[PDB]
């Protein structure tokens, strides 16, 4: 109504528009950082898949459980999540295609364990029910691959128990600076001359697989922290834009209000001289 | 209001209390819309401060107590002073928000922090 | 090793039984449970339709 409340309005929009275009930058700046660390873990796991892929090769005599699939009706998921909100999308895609997945092996009678990283997966499985197994949140931006041997090791040894017949692990893609795309993608069930091998060959083996399944868990969930920056990037941008269209409204009912005003005043003001 | 009439220490000590109060107004708006959380460092203990401040400046009058119900307090100039001083300093910043509102001088809301 | 080649696939902690064990301990005893859900619902393609189409109005 009154024309002093509405620049008030004005006010409070324009001050909230600020920071919103602030905190697009430094989204975008934390999207790099986040980039610079998925590319140092590269050289490591690609050298343990090398690795992995001539021993398997050399001693036919060995097979571990994770290299030979068991057909059974249980499986397990990994759930990669943030922990953080003022994102545009990246749980609810996530979760959209998880639930897709699921229902397959629901519908297919087969029983389902679930591992959860970050508080969004964590509120998700309490609120709807989900049966976790094992559950870790509050990591920093800059996370340390000793904080998944927990959670990634009770998702072992169940697969190792035969509790577990396939393991899986749900993230986002970096696609580019403007796409992430949510996946589900297989973990357990994976130049003619021989090594050395010091120790056992088999041992050394049943200790570079469990390395190498943590270095893919390593790798998703830094990889989905620059997609987190980079859908908060767009989700800031988009709220600086729609905090204009708002302060364009007001703008217009602001010049409506003003108008009036010095026509209502120029009324009385010749309304009493008239009678005077 | 003028440090040849009044000394530099007053005039420090209102001119940094209006500085912070002043801050904290253009941040208000932004806490209502993304949370506390959302903040710098320096913001969040800023917006600390300023609401000790603005509690801090209320006082329990003679003539209000049959408003009030609690009995009537009168604060002199250096008390004035140094309590506003402290808070600005941070030598509150272990205190609760609501330790410093109707108390009178700055020991009335350690007093009242322990209650 | 390799006649032209060397690497060394290091640990950034003593990998350990005891040490090693502590952290699964831990994953299992952090799991909070309030409710024994089935996992069987269909609500959560109701609420991630209805966030989904939100999101859109959004842009």
């Known amino acids: 109504a009154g024309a002093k409340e509405i620049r008030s309005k004005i006010a409070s929009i324009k001050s909230t528009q600020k920071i919103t275009n602030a905190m697009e930058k430094v989204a975008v700046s934390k999207m790099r950082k986040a980039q610079m660390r998925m590319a140092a873990g590269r050289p490591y796991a690609e050298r343990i898949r090398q690795v992995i892929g001539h021993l398997a090769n050399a001693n036919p005599e060995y097979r571990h459980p994770f290299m030979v699939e068991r057909e059974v009706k249980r499986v397990g998921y990994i759930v990669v999540s943030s922990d953080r909100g003022l994102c545009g999308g990246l749980n609810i895609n996530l979760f959209k295609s998880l639930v897709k997945d699921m229902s397959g092996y629901r519908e297919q009678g087969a029983e389902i364990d679930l591992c959860v990283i970050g508080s969004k997966g964590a509120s998700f499985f309490r609120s709807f029910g989900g049966n976790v197994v094992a559950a870790i949140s509050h990591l920093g931006e800059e996370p340390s691959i000793n904080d998944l041997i927990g959670s990634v090791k009770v998702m072992l040894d169940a697969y190792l128990e035969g509790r577990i017949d396939r393991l899986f692990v749900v993230s986002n893609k970096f696609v580019n600076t403007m796409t992430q795309k949510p996946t589900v993608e297989q973990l357990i069930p994976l130049h003619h001359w021989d090594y050395l091998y010091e120790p056992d060959a088999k041992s050394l083996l049943d200790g570079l697989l469990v390395r190498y399944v943590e270095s893919q868990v390593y790798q998703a969930v830094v990889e989905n922290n620059a997609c987190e920056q980079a859908a908060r990037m767009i989700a800031m941008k988009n709220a600086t834009d729609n905090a204009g269209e708002l302060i364009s409204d007001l703008q217009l009912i602001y010049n409506k209000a003003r108008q009036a005003a010095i026509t209502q005043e120029i009324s009385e003001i010749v309304g009493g001289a008239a009678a005077v | ?115 | 090793v390799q006649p032209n080649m060397v690497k060394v696939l290091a640990d950034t902690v003593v990998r350990a039984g005891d040490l090693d064990e502590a952290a699964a301990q831990e994953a299992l005893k952090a799991a909070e449970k309030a409710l024994q859900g089935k996992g069987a619902e269909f609500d959560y393609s109701a609420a991630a339709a209805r966030l989904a189409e939100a999101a859109a109005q959004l842009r």
């Open chain 2, 1 to 115: 209001l003028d440090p040849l009439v009044i000394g530099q220490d007053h005039y420090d000590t209102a001119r940094g209390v209006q500085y912070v109060l002043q801050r904290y107004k253009e941040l208000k708006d932004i806490i209502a819309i993304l949370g506390m959380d959302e903040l710098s460092e320096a913001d969040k203990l800023l917006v600390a401060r300023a609401r000790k401040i603005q509690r801090f400046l209320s006082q329990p009058f003679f003539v209000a107590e049959v408003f009030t119900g609690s009995p009537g307090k009168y604060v002199s100039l250096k008390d004035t002073i140094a309590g506003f001083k402290g808070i600005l300093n941070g030598d509150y910043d272990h205190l609760p928000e609501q330790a410093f509102y109707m108390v009178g001088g700055i020991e009335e809301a350690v007093e009242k922090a322990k209650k």
